[PDB]
Subunit: 225 residues, 3 copies
């Protein structure tokens, strides 16, 4: 009969449709799972506190670079790029020369800069102190005014001086003076002693003359009698 | 015969319900896909976009004077840029003539260079006001007082040099009495002799 | 007849159902394609060796910046930020003044720092050598000890000296000495001439008298 075969056909087709449905359910389940896993990987790979919410929505990352906040990776990368350019600019310290100094700039091997600092060859200062010796506008001073060289000349504390006002021998002798030749040259003791000899000779001549005079007087007295 | 028909009808009813449920599930999964793609593109930035046709235009980044098509390449480029900038920005200081430089570490980790002079200076000249120190010696003022390799010279005044002593047409004061033959004599020592000659003249006059 | 009609009705329903199955399969396929576009784009955009596996899953990115290891973009960006801060701080060299030096900090036009180095106005040193002339604790020395100024005074090698011990004329004459005024002033040769003349005169006198006495004797 056509009826029984038609029922059989119908049941067969239903069986096949049910199997197809089972298959489709499996597919959809799998794809859903895959999608969920993709969302999770996205969130975990981005970081920035990204997370999948219960309502199916996804909160994106918020990054915190270069003293700001960015809602995506591109803005953050740009922020960092700028941060680097600025940091490279302001961190590059320089050196220059002032009074008495010479600064020579050159490249180090790695491309950074070196500044070699030297003094000038001629120094202009207020003073230079080296131990007990002081150099300033007034001149040279050694010790506690022990020896002074200034614009009037040389002065030694407790000793002689050679200044504009002339020569002070400091109540000590002046030694090793060669014999005076010119009228305005200093005479030494020997040159004076030379005259002293003549004085002695004169006094002897006078002595013997006096004795000869007394002899004469005595002879005159005897001649008178 | 009829019960079987009722059973088939119920079977078909249930199948129709299953189809409807399935369509809803597909729809939901599609929504999840859209959420994923849009979140992806929005989070990547760099002009990435999901296009109408379902295709996706990736991000393009522009860091370190280059263009990058992915996050990793950008991060790497930035890393290298940082390293290079760090290297070339770190300035150094060294010493030349008459200078000493001492390098130390600051608190924050940077370098400090302390610059001092050497303790012994080698120069061409040192000027302090009217006083000049140079190869020739010491010069004060416009050659008012000069100390050189010959000795001491005072302009319009006396001088003590290798050639000898020049009193500069002025008296030499505070000279102690000569003792040795080569010592200088003072006025008093002459006055004694003058007194002697005076006595001699009185002796002659009395004679 | 009602049975046969319910039968045909059922067959019609089944036909339409089969059609719905087919359509649903195509739709799921489309969704699959879109999922591929998604995972592929994710992996390609992250880099860091990210990869879509043939077996459906995804292997995430690994990053190696700032001498570290990062498994997400956030950590990488933070690492780079820290790297920038650190490098900015440590590359900023500073200069300070030591003995006899003055250092002045000011801003360059681009915001970096400049350090101007000068000497102090008053220097403390052990010595200054300027050619043949040396300044040190001992004093001033010129040449190979040719001329020396120390705490005892001035001494010229092979020449005169003005020192604590007094004035040494150096076996040379002292020239241009004005006539002595006070008792302790130096006398010049000229100041003796008069005296010398006197001596001579005296001699003359003596001589004459001597001879005249002889004339008296005879």
């Amino acid at each position: 009969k056509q009826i029984e075969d038609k029922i059989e056909e119908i049941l067969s087709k239903i069986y096949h449709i049910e199997n197809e449905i089972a298959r489709i359910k499996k597919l959809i389940k799998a794809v859903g799972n895959q999608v969920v896993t993709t969302q999770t990987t996205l969130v975990n790979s981005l970081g920035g506190n990204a997370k999948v919410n219960a309502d199916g929505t996804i909160t994106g990352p918020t990054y915190n670079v270069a003293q700001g906040n960015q809602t995506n990776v591109g803005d953050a990368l740009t922020a960092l790029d700028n941060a680097i350019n600025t940091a490279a600019t302001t961190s590059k310290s320089t050196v220059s020369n002032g009074q008495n100094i010479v600064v020579s700039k050159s490249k180090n091997a790695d491309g950074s800069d070196n500044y070699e600092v030297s003094t000038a060859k001629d120094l202009t200062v207020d003073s230079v102190k080296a131990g007990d010796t002081v150099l300033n506008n007034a001149g040279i001073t050694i010790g506690n005014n022990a020896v002074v060289l200034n614009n009037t000349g040389l002065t030694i504390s407790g000793g002689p001086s050679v200044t504009l006002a002339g020569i002070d021998a400091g109540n000590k002798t002046i030694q090793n003076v060669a014999n005076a030749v010119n009228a305005t040259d200093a005479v030494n003791k020997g040159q004076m002693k030379q005259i002293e000899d003549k004085i002695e000779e004169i006094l002897s001549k006078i002595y013997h003359i006096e004795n000869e005079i007394a002899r004469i007087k005595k002879l005159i007295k005897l001649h008178h009698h």
